[PDB]
Homo-oligomer: A and B are copies of this chain.
Amino acid sequence: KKILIVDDEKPISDIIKFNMTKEGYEVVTAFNGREALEQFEAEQPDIIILDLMIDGLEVAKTIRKTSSVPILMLSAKDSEFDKVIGLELGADDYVTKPFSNRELQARVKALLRRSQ
Protein backbone atom coordinates (compact mmCIF):
# COMPACT_ATOMS: atom_id res chain seq x y z
CA LYS A 1 0.00 0.00 0.00
CA LYS A 2 0.99 3.62 -0.67
CA ILE A 3 0.91 6.42 1.89
CA LEU A 4 1.17 10.10 1.07
CA ILE A 5 2.63 12.02 3.99
CA VAL A 6 1.83 15.70 3.78
CA ASP A 7 3.94 17.52 6.38
CA ASP A 8 5.71 20.86 6.15
CA GLU A 9 8.24 19.96 8.83
CA LYS A 10 10.99 17.74 7.44
CA PRO A 11 12.04 16.17 10.81
CA ILE A 12 8.57 14.80 11.45
CA SER A 13 8.01 13.81 7.81
CA ASP A 14 11.23 11.84 8.18
CA ILE A 15 10.09 10.02 11.32
CA ILE A 16 6.72 9.07 9.85
CA LYS A 17 8.39 8.09 6.55
CA PHE A 18 10.90 5.85 8.36
CA ASN A 19 8.16 4.20 10.44
CA MET A 20 5.74 3.58 7.53
CA THR A 21 8.63 2.27 5.39
CA LYS A 22 9.62 -0.15 8.19
CA GLU A 23 6.00 -1.34 8.04
CA GLY A 24 6.23 -2.14 4.27
CA TYR A 25 4.35 0.84 2.87
CA GLU A 26 5.53 2.77 -0.17
CA VAL A 27 5.87 6.40 0.97
CA VAL A 28 5.49 9.61 -1.03
CA THR A 29 5.93 12.98 0.64
CA ALA A 30 4.59 16.51 0.08
CA PHE A 31 5.69 19.57 2.02
CA ASN A 32 2.93 22.06 1.20
CA GLY A 33 -0.67 22.16 -0.01
CA ARG A 34 0.22 22.45 -3.68
CA GLU A 35 2.59 19.47 -3.53
CA ALA A 36 -0.11 17.56 -1.54
CA LEU A 37 -2.61 17.92 -4.34
CA GLU A 38 -0.05 17.23 -7.07
CA GLN A 39 1.13 14.07 -5.34
CA PHE A 40 -2.45 12.92 -4.63
CA GLU A 41 -3.37 13.24 -8.32
CA ALA A 42 -0.21 11.68 -9.73
CA GLU A 43 0.39 8.91 -7.15
CA GLN A 44 -3.14 7.94 -6.15
CA PRO A 45 -2.18 7.04 -2.58
CA ASP A 46 -4.26 4.55 -0.56
CA ILE A 47 -4.16 6.83 2.51
CA ILE A 48 -3.07 10.39 3.20
CA ILE A 49 -1.52 11.64 6.47
CA LEU A 50 -2.11 15.39 6.57
CA ASP A 51 -0.07 17.67 8.93
CA LEU A 52 0.28 21.19 7.50
CA MET A 53 0.91 24.23 9.81
CA ILE A 54 -6.09 26.40 7.28
CA ASP A 55 -4.09 25.01 4.27
CA GLY A 56 -4.50 21.45 5.61
CA LEU A 57 -8.26 21.98 5.85
CA GLU A 58 -8.43 23.17 2.16
CA VAL A 59 -6.32 20.24 1.00
CA ALA A 60 -8.74 17.83 2.64
CA LYS A 61 -11.75 19.75 1.33
CA THR A 62 -10.34 19.71 -2.22
CA ILE A 63 -9.52 15.98 -2.18
CA ARG A 64 -13.09 15.12 -1.02
CA LYS A 65 -14.45 16.81 -4.17
CA THR A 66 -13.28 13.77 -6.17
CA SER A 67 -12.01 11.10 -3.79
CA SER A 68 -12.94 8.97 -0.83
CA VAL A 69 -9.28 8.15 -0.02
CA PRO A 70 -8.79 7.95 3.78
CA ILE A 71 -7.31 11.05 5.38
CA LEU A 72 -5.70 10.93 8.79
CA MET A 73 -5.13 14.41 10.10
CA LEU A 74 -2.22 14.97 12.42
CA SER A 75 -1.85 18.26 14.29
CA ALA A 76 -0.36 19.87 17.34
CA LYS A 77 -3.80 21.54 17.83
CA ASP A 78 -5.83 19.36 20.18
CA SER A 79 -8.92 21.46 21.03
CA GLU A 80 -12.50 20.16 20.56
CA PHE A 81 -13.05 22.76 17.89
CA ASP A 82 -9.98 21.61 15.98
CA LYS A 83 -10.81 17.91 16.04
CA VAL A 84 -14.46 18.46 15.14
CA ILE A 85 -13.79 20.68 12.15
CA GLY A 86 -11.02 18.41 10.85
CA LEU A 87 -13.49 15.51 10.90
CA GLU A 88 -16.35 17.58 9.42
CA LEU A 89 -14.12 18.74 6.50
CA GLY A 90 -13.58 15.09 5.67
CA ALA A 91 -10.82 13.65 7.85
CA ASP A 92 -11.46 10.05 8.85
CA ASP A 93 -9.35 10.44 11.94
CA TYR A 94 -7.49 13.13 13.77
CA VAL A 95 -4.44 12.46 15.89
CA THR A 96 -2.52 14.94 17.99
CA LYS A 97 1.21 15.66 18.05
CA PRO A 98 3.27 14.44 19.70
CA PHE A 99 2.01 10.95 18.86
CA SER A 100 2.93 7.38 19.51
CA ASN A 101 4.57 5.71 16.53
CA ARG A 102 2.73 2.41 17.32
CA GLU A 103 -0.64 4.16 17.63
CA LEU A 104 -0.15 5.98 14.33
CA GLN A 105 0.62 2.59 12.69
CA ALA A 106 -2.44 1.03 14.29
CA ARG A 107 -4.69 3.84 13.10
CA VAL A 108 -3.33 3.74 9.51
CA LYS A 109 -4.01 -0.03 9.57
CA ALA A 110 -7.54 0.52 10.90
CA LEU A 111 -8.30 3.06 8.18
CA LEU A 112 -7.00 0.84 5.36
CA ARG A 113 -8.99 -2.18 6.70
CA ARG A 114 -12.09 0.00 6.51
CA SER A 115 -11.55 1.28 2.99
CA GLN A 116 -10.47 -2.11 1.57
Complex formed: what's the CA distance from A9 to B88 in Å?
25
User: Closest B-chain residue to A80, C-beta based?
Assistant: B54
A88: chain B residues within 8 A (beta carbon) = 54, 57-58, 61
Q: How many residues of A contact B (CB 8 A)?
A: 9
A85 CB to nearest B CB, Å: 7
A111 to B58, CA, bound (A): 24
A36 to chain B, nearest CB (A): 16
Q: For the complex, what is the distance from the CA of A4 to the CA of B54, rounded to whole Å?
A: 29
Closest 7 CB pairs of A and B: A54-B84, A58-B88, A54-B81, A61-B88, A54-B85, A57-B85, A57-B88
